[PDB]
Design an enzyme around this catalytic site. Sequence first.
Site, PDB file in Angstrom:
ATOM      1  N   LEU A  14      34.472   0.881  28.888  1.00  0.00           N
ATOM      2  CA  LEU A  14      34.062   2.013  28.055  1.00  0.00           C
ATOM      3  C   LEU A  14      33.985   1.580  26.589  1.00  0.00           C
ATOM      4  O   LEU A  14      33.108   2.063  25.871  1.00  0.00           O
ATOM      5  CB  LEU A  14      34.939   3.267  28.251  1.00  0.00           C
ATOM      6  CG  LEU A  14      34.878   3.995  29.625  1.00  0.00           C
ATOM      7  CD1 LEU A  14      35.900   5.110  29.698  1.00  0.00           C
ATOM      8  CD2 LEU A  14      33.484   4.565  29.936  1.00  0.00           C
ATOM      9  N   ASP A 132      41.001   8.714  11.803  1.00  0.00           N
ATOM     10  CA  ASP A 132      39.721   8.122  12.235  1.00  0.00           C
ATOM     11  C   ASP A 132      38.740   9.183  12.777  1.00  0.00           C
ATOM     12  O   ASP A 132      38.045   8.957  13.778  1.00  0.00           O
ATOM     13  CB  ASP A 132      39.926   6.931  13.219  1.00  0.00           C
ATOM     14  CG  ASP A 132      38.772   5.924  13.294  1.00  0.00           C
ATOM     15  OD1 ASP A 132      37.738   6.130  12.594  1.00  0.00           O
ATOM     16  OD2 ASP A 132      38.873   4.968  14.089  1.00  0.00           O
TER      17      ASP A 132
HETATM   18  C1  LIG Z   1      38.411   5.292  23.803  1.00  0.00           C
HETATM   19  C2  LIG Z   1      37.091   4.640  24.210  1.00  0.00           C
HETATM   20  C3  LIG Z   1      36.130   4.253  23.074  1.00  0.00           C
HETATM   21  C4  LIG Z   1      36.203   2.765  22.783  1.00  0.00           C
HETATM   22  N1  LIG Z   1      34.760   4.607  23.478  1.00  0.00           N
HETATM   23  C5  LIG Z   1      34.076   5.549  24.265  1.00  0.00           C
HETATM   24  C6  LIG Z   1      32.663   5.573  24.173  1.00  0.00           C
HETATM   25  C7  LIG Z   1      31.968   6.388  25.054  1.00  0.00           C
HETATM   26  N2  LIG Z   1      32.543   7.128  26.001  1.00  0.00           N
HETATM   27  C8  LIG Z   1      34.037   7.018  26.001  1.00  0.00           C
HETATM   28  C9  LIG Z   1      34.788   7.829  26.967  1.00  0.00           C
HETATM   29  C10 LIG Z   1      34.164   8.614  27.904  1.00  0.00           C
HETATM   30  N3  LIG Z   1      35.103   9.356  28.608  1.00  0.00           N
HETATM   31  C11 LIG Z   1      36.354   9.068  28.127  1.00  0.00           C
HETATM   32  N4  LIG Z   1      37.501   9.729  28.448  1.00  0.00           N
HETATM   33  C12 LIG Z   1      38.600   9.378  27.739  1.00  0.00           C
HETATM   34  C13 LIG Z   1      38.605   8.403  26.770  1.00  0.00           C
HETATM   35  C14 LIG Z   1      37.415   7.740  26.466  1.00  0.00           C
HETATM   36  C15 LIG Z   1      36.242   8.078  27.140  1.00  0.00           C
HETATM   37  N5  LIG Z   1      34.768   6.279  25.155  1.00  0.00           N
HETATM   38  C16 LIG Z   1      36.486   4.999  21.771  1.00  0.00           C
HETATM   39  O1  LIG Z   1      37.583   4.862  21.216  1.00  0.00           O
HETATM   40  N6  LIG Z   1      35.533   5.839  21.373  1.00  0.00           N
HETATM   41  C17 LIG Z   1      35.544   7.296  21.508  1.00  0.00           C
HETATM   42  C18 LIG Z   1      36.626   8.299  21.760  1.00  0.00           C
HETATM   43  F1  LIG Z   1      36.200   9.477  21.636  1.00  0.00           F
HETATM   44  F2  LIG Z   1      37.120   8.210  22.905  1.00  0.00           F
HETATM   45  F3  LIG Z   1      37.608   8.196  20.972  1.00  0.00           F
END
Ligand SMILES: CC[C@@](C)(Nc1ccnc(-c2c[nH]c3ncccc23)n1)C(=O)NCC(F)(F)F
Length: 286
Positions: A14, A132
């Site tokens: 992810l 953040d």
């Molecule tokens: C933590 C995962 C990470 C690296 N990128 C993503 C990117 C796209 N989709 C998901 C995801 C889908 N579904 C989930 N359900 C729970 C946690 C993450 C995901 N994560 C991040 O830090 N960016 C976003 C945040 F909102 F989560 F914070």
Amino acid sequence: TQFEERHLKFLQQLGKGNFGSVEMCRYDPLQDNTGEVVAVKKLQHSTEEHLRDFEREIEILKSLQHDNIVKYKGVCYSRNLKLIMEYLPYGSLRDYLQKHKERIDHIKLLQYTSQICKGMEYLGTKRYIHRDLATRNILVENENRVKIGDFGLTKVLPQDKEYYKVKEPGESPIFWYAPESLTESKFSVASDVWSFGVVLYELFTYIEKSKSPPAEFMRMIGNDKQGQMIVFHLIELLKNNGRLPRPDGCPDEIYMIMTECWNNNVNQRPSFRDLALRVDQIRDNM
Ligand SMILES: CC[C@@](C)(Nc1ccnc(-c2c[nH]c3ncccc23)n1)C(=O)NCC(F)(F)F
């Protein structure tokens, strides 16, 4: 109830960040591929300092129960802990908005804005500082619901203070940072409100690449600025009231909310309780 490591089937990566990685996994104890799809966070390079911060993030997420905060599910023990969270299939608000663009109207952007405020207000009642807040850190559950994700940078306010001071900063999203966070590494509800103004801006630009806060700020300071000189010039620009422009077609009233969030005076910035009331009124009027 507990999560067995042996039953967590890897599906897809992810993302990666602040010494961690997030994977989409199927929790399949029946071994018939009918198990629940979950999001799993683990440390990549697990030092004693990183374990300590990861444990604190786990405690923070477990303490939060709100409709606009990603749900904690559990922990998997094998320390080399794994944080289990609900998987939100629509992904980040950043990706969702970039794909669906103007087919999401202003009314809908304001429904998301309200939910972000509510999640943030609830976070503030626990004396937690997100640090953040960005569209990349907001997840879409469905067409009608968004949730604050990634608590990896969250700080708990000291009992006797209204700010958290970071002595040795890591990777910083400087184009989302309040002036006092840039100059003194001071984080508070007020600095989270400043980042929220930046989130509102991202929304109303519909994630257009040339219109992003790093692209706009770099054009304002000069694209010739490099490294620590970027921070030096961004501080001086903010001090002399350089701000992000009003996004094309953004209602005057929504731009005013952004500009109030972007006040150099920390005490003059609105509260999340006020923002949710204000945004709900705009929605109602529309
Ligand atoms: C933590 C995962 C990470 C690296 N990128 C993503 C990117 C796209 N989709 C998901 C995801 C889908 N579904 C989930 N359900 C729970 C946690 C993450 C995901 N994560 C991040 O830090 N960016 C976003 C945040 F909102 F989560 F914070």
